[PDB]
């Protein structure tokens, strides 16, 4: 069937850096195949496809590299491969803003389960990867105590421990340790879970802290039991908490087991079926927090006893009746295990490979590797190809990169639119500062070994301190194998600096300079320090130093971070160790950091449209407010539509039922479209047969609301006549037949002859609720005019008489109706006048005055437009009216079904019409053109002088958005939506920001709420350099079992969140936010660098309309001491 081994130097890249992917193709057997290509596709987190290739193989091997984009979205990416099979093999790989480790951490306890009173202790082993051990490096940690449910790891499905056991999950005392011992340190706890009859586990999450700096954090787990062996329960039912369907019986498998020791036996196991009545709940809103929930009582329903012999899988079954139960087996010894359920709601041909490699080496000189393959024979069958890569070991430990082993790869068995042009999610938050961390990765060419299975590569190594990992893979046509080797690289004396990931301009940190002697002879040096760029030394370093062999002591370097955006640098010139051996006298080192401002960027949004020959320039004072260094702009130049938010509304279906307006407004648009247009208009209403069939129904239904005199009532033919709707209804019924519907003849006639008497004798007409009868009656008369006029049944005489009562008119809509009525029956000169008047008559938009036309400024335009499309009239105004209608989009909070339709009927127009635009620009002196709509990115200098001029036959529409850091902290700006930031502790209680020592964890609470529905929201919490997010997307490093106050976690879980990114300087969340609905975001961070840091304001924006943003309230300064 074909098997494709995908493999690479690593699975953790970092936005910016090039990716390497390798491939080998074999069959079901694992033998070679005929030479062929393999389509590879690169896949972004969301699901889209960045790029794709047809990888040709050179010499049995597939290779694929491509440069991962600086602003690429952090997530998990995939490369997948079509093997013609139409099953895609995926190669997953991480992209995160990540920091290679520079240290290691082994933590162990023996794997034997303890007993209740047995204290718990763990091993610690702190060691820098250049060789040295953490001598005196402190260690933060947290000791948790969590229920251990799947204790028998050879019987997953069986659950162990009393599911209702009070207080089983606690977070025990915090860990704190100098580990002065060059080797190590140790961590114990005394038992406090005497009581339990349930199997528990103690969990240690430990962080080994670099010198005034980052953590390298790992967790160890140490099981705990209460008996020799424990009772187990597997509920037979599935699909989660498991439950019986109805009042059916509760099927269970039941057992008794040792640590893994299968099936030990005792009789007298007391099985019970406990039920839980839960009544009473809630608490006053504005309790702060809000509400609370139910209390319960537990009563027994069976006391059935079951016996069990060794190797026996018990089986109890019990009928139940619609409540929350739980099954609770009690062992003689006293270990209990409950489980809860609710009845309702709510072969060796591998090639032996060995690697000749130094155990240790200095940097800057090539690393030579030699490869010999035993082949499990005298000599290795055919040609030996070997590919060999080298990777900084601190990169592979975060992923825990198992080296790729081809052998067991072959033989190893048993989304429509957001609007975010790519990539803007960052851009709007503001250019991130540039992160200079350098990753060390080399891959060699594939080698063909000799006839003795021997060969050698030389991987040139640069300036580096730490462990390397050499890895190699080998293949013949039929045989495969691999191996890895750990090659330390150090200097005679290491000096590596410690910095935060960035610094906000104004921030001040105290960088630590690690410096270790690996020479054996004591040495005396002078570390002369310079700082240039947007970074300056505040004070004066210790001049000279002195060290024994194998000892490091650090220097502290305090640093004012200068205003602006760019890069700062620290130069060390290190004098000493002038050598007749190493051939050296001095050594110069450089280190660089990114400086950005301390507040989030802003954006500005212009949109207009230009009929040919018009020119759009940009305001002079419009960008006046931004820092130009970091300002960029988009300029989408669509030639087909306006705002065109055909969506932002829907689904749309046929509702034949209800009163007369429900019914009419229910069907009125279903006349004019079908599934086709709909599943292509990005919305789907009704099966095409269900729509027609459902119109047919509402027709015959309306007819029965037709009174004798031919006009209509709301519910029955005996109803009080409703005047304006009688017109409306007819309009529908007339239109109906033109769209292939059957309307009875006279029914329509009885109605028309009535509509006439709407023109001739308004005296009869009495409108029930509405005032301004003058205007209400006029509006009625003109709708009735149109309708009859379409039929050629609107007598030119009566159209005049109403043409002079025109001063009564409230809206322009009637006039436009009456213009077209006139136009069509003769007398175009009144028509043209009545029309041309209509267009310059607006409605007062307070509209509580209630005229009985169900209208508004909003729809009467949408209809005045939907009219002109029909008659092909005054197309110049058509754009004008359309553009004014576009702008009813800001005012799209709660539209009626009449405004919806009347819009949708104007909107369905846009779909077909092209398209074609042409325009001159300030930039690209060439004529820009396009079939569709095209974006164009602009820098500061381009856009400050930006002008755009149409050049074509059609009008175009241009949107621009421009984003960059301002000169000065935006004052807190609530608009549409808004945002609070609260720094909670680890114990869930607001933390004094001045109270922070390094290594401390902190919980950040973002409450985001809105007055609209804003589905393209963008949360962007910038950071104070003091903090660094503890990334979860990864993790071998740190978790939200750590987070105690679930109040909020639970909430977060509900919210519709497209993605959360954890990035060097920014918390970023794309999300949908609503009214009546807050959106709780919580994210875990740590304080690393000591100093005093400016806290940005938290912000959020709507992607589509940037004017919808909320700069939240600025917090005070963050101070970190140690």
Residue numbers in the entry: 385 to 623, 636 to 742, 855 to 922, 943 to 1562, 1566 to 1653
Sentences reproduced from the published study:
α-2-Macroglobulins (α2Ms) are found in eukaryotic blood, invertebrate haemolymph, the eggs of birds and reptiles, and the bacterial periplasm, where they are thought to play a role in the restriction of proteolytic cleavage. Escherichia coli α2M (ECAM) contains the conserved thioester bond that is characteristic of the α2Ms and which is essential for covalent binding to cleaving proteases. Pbp1C is predicted to be a bifunctional transpeptidase and transglycosylase owing to its homology to Pbp1A and Pbp1B, which are both essential for the synthesis of the peptidoglycan layer. Both ECAM and Pbp1C are periplasmic proteins that are anchored to the inner membrane and have been proposed to function together in defence and repair against proteases that damage the bacterial cell wall. The overall structure of α2Ms comprises a series of β-sheet sandwich macroglobulin (MG) domains forming a ‘keyring’ shape, a bait-region domain (BRD) spanning the body of the ring, a mostly helical thioester domain (TED) connected to the ‘keyring’ by a complement protein subcomponent (CUB) domain, and a C-terminal MG (CTMG) domain.
To elucidate the mechanism of protease-induced α2M activation, we crystallized and solved the X-ray structure of a porcine elastase-cleaved form of ECAM, a close homologue of SaA2M (81% amino-acid sequence identity) for which the structure of the unactivated form was recently solved. However, an alternative strategy of in situ proteolysis and crystallization with selenomethionine-labelled ECAM was successful. This method yielded crystals that diffracted to 3.65 Å resolution. Analysis of elastase-cleaved ECAM by SDS–PAGE and mass spectrometry confirms that MG domains 1, 2, 3 and 7 are absent from the crystallized protein. Most notably, in the structure of the protease-cleaved ECAM, interactions between the TED and the CTMG domain, which protects the thioester bond in unactivated SaA2M, are not present. Thioester bond release is achieved by the untethering of a large region of an unstructured polypeptide chain upon cleavage of the BRD that forms new interactions with the CTMG domain, thereby preventing the protective interaction with the TED. Specifically, in the elastase-cleaved form of ECAM additional residues (Phe947–Asn963) of the BRD are observed that are disordered in the uncleaved SaA2M structure. The buried surface area between the CTMG domain and TED in SaA2M is 1972 Å2, with three hydrogen bonds between these domains, whereas the buried surface area between the elastase-cleaved BRD and the CTMG domain in ECAM is 1438 Å2, with five hydrogen bonds between the domains.
